[PDB]
């Protein structure tokens, strides 16, 4: 259906490397649709940087403890169907914040929490897929003053349980887009 | 941008039709990516019957008094696109209900709030553009015995002040789903 | 992946019908890409008749003894690509008939054997999927006056256990394509 | 119709390059979908490895005296399309070789004789074709060792004159890919 | 890359009612497989349920003629009404073009050609689930135009309606071979 | 609708890279569908020239003075789609230049007057967009010698006004392009 790695022992870290087409094949042997979450730094390197804008005016992006999302949907490489299930994916998030008490708020593909950022993420397509990316905070050290952060210790969640909890609703989340999509009929 | 509409003071009903193809433009002449919302019946023809599953189990649709969705978007007819969306865009009302005081859920595309159905929704496509339907119940009478549903009403809510902010934060959520497909670069 | 229905308790006939798209999810539930098998009698309704050509010489699409299969993917719906695994598809039958000591060969989309045609196959698809039919003759009963047909009867085949053998080399055919299209990078 | 070039007598090098977009018109000016059949040695550079899966298990992609086929077809950039036609084309090479007098079989993408691989395939996308590479030894030297291969020159057969009618045989194969594509209605 | 189907009918007249626009018409009526070009003359009377422009539709409008000179085009191309859209007012442009030739000091608007203010065709682009489908229509006469919009035909311009049809097919058919080359001979770009 | 950026303070030459995707949005800050006309110098680099008809035959693409229009259109990167519009806005420009009492005539592409070739124009695709580039010849100074060529100054046309009107009469183009594909139905 979905190939789910959470990668639970060690860590990796995420340069934005990551977002290339056939990460997760290539470095695990995962074929076809695929959601890796891991943890570990993030230093986007400039040169692996989607978001055009944040490259027009050079923003950082950084963090030692963040929880990774990569995600690689082999469906047709539409850049507004990268962006819809970005945003339904962040939003399953911030409603999953809640069973843990957290008032999360969302600003497109952005999760707030008491006026403070706590994800990032990012949405594009291969020449061959779907690529996105979801980053959660898990402490606020490493981050690039301007806006203030906010991690999930500080939240008091623990990172190997909603790494859990969050990439099995996820899972569900996709599963359900390609299910539905399949049991309507077209119409005139 | 995105046309929108919303019908206040006459009363239109939903059998199904409106999720056809260029319903907006030929009955109101409002031309491409278009969200119309009004308030009326709600008494969905077989003939009109877009879930296959529901045919499949003769299953009803109908409520006396329902707040209605219908949105066409002139982009790729790909039905993957049409579930994505459809659901983001609950996840949307849902989060808005959380601004009215209420404890909404969503249950994949579908509205829960105590355990009880608040509305129904189908996705799908025509040739020419992707077609959704969201239906919210205001009242609970005239809705068919299985699910227990509840409405607007009786969370004590005015529908025509909902539709004016839902309307929006739907417009919203979709012009935003379109600039973020326009600020990323691909990747390899 | 793909389910797969052979329906062995019963006869079916095929009057062209089961060529519309979710056929298969209407009849028998089976959400998805699907491969239905059964057997059963064949005469097409010029109403449901797919061959543009056939419509054209007035020609019958006949048989008292069918072996069927019904195969519908819910992919981008390019004929093409219909096309293209319709003659793959046939191809594999070919091969698969010499494994049972016959002399068959293909003309495109027919299979032969003894000069005489054993197969009728027709590839299309709707706005949601791509739709294929394979129909081999099990007797010769009931086909048109223009040329010689042969059944699988005479070839000293078991239908049943035919259709058990050719429905998984179908469904292992289509697995590979799928899975081949998800190792490859693309190139520039 | 579609293009044609067969070089017999000189001799050009595989060293995966030829599987880019645009090869053939811009090499020898050959405009649109077009094959181009060729002979010569065999040695794919890292740099240039298609299948992510030898890229993984590092194999080696080489021989001395190999029968190339480099296809470019300017239809939609689909994977499952070009997974697709490949293999139709491997299958209409296999049942060529019965007209020889060769017991050949197909696995998926390769031709096997008496237990041995006689090619090397695959077929990807650019972001405006779509590209199949087919490979046939003519001698077995300078095949890496694994598994046992075999040539074009044990089985007894001219390379020249094969080229010659697999060449047709491959083009007629895609026109009726094409044709049979156009003459058929869509279906509800 | 190589070519396309075309075929004048010169023996006798075909009228539209508009279903000549549906997919497969000039497979299923002439046999002719693939892309094509079919162009005919006759009346023009495009039954409502036939009608492609919606605005027509609510505006209800009469599209009618006595004598009008048919474009049926057909390409089975990737089914986009962009596509459709663009292709359809490139071919009204070469048509405008080529009526300088006859001397004529003709204009476009959209997909509409004009002459002194007056409008000499009408035309449409669309698709169906496997194919672009394009018409286009030139008064030959202004007789049996519904009244409102002044109408221009072929006859008070002085040209001779088959000769047009002639040289106006070749002029789209090469434009539509134009168009499939060039777009094969371009590197993709990043 | 569509952003229009006419530069007309300072001048920027071509070298062939603004052909490139986001090139409006990396550079001007212009998100979406946009047309960018500005004046300077053509000197096209090699590694940047998208004609390959171009590079086969080494053809230098140099001009000192000429107006430039890039266009881009985040639509389905159709390549039929890229042709077939630019042709239809250079059919625009050559009907615009008889508003200037200029007897303008077309070749596919190409604008003439007199013989001479006013103009160079390409047509591509991104793996996420279309892009257009039209020339139009201030001054013949520069130009490598082969074809007559000629320019505005000649032809009595003031490139400043003219860049104002023709800007205006492209986008118009583009938005009926959209417009007439919005309002009709699709047909069976």
């Known amino acids: 259906s979905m190939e789910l790695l959470i990668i639970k022992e060690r860590r ?3 340069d934005g490397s990551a ?3 056939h990460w997760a094949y290539r470095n695990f042997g995962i074929l076809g ?3 890796v979450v891991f943890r570990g730094k993030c ?3 400039v040169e692996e940087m989607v978001d055009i804008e944040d490259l027009r005016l050079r923003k950082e992006i950084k963090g030692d403890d963040m929880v990774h999302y990569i995600l690689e949907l082999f469906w047709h490489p539409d850049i507004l169907l990268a962006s819809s299930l970005q945003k339904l994916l962040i939003a399953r998030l911030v409603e999953l914040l809640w069973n843990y008490g957290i008032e999360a708020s969302r600003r497109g593909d952005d999760i707030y929490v008491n006026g403070r950022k706590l994800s ?3 949405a594009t397509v291969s020449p061959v897929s779907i690529k996105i990316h979801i980053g959660l905070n898990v402490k606020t050290v490493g981050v690039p003053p301007g806006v203030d952060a906010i991690g999930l210790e ?3 969640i623990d990172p190997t349980e909603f790494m859990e909890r969050s990439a ?3 899972v569900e989340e996709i599963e359900k887009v390609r299910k539905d999509s399949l049991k309507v ?3 005139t």
């Open 12 to 14: 990796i870290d995420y």
């Open 19 to 21: 977002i290339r087409s």
């Open 33 to 35: 649709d695929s959601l």
């Open 43 to 45: 230093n986007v390197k």
């Open 120 to 122: 990032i993420s990012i």
């Open 154 to 156: 500080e939240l008091g």
């Open 168 to 170: 099995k609703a996820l």
């Open 185 to 187: 009929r077209w119409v």
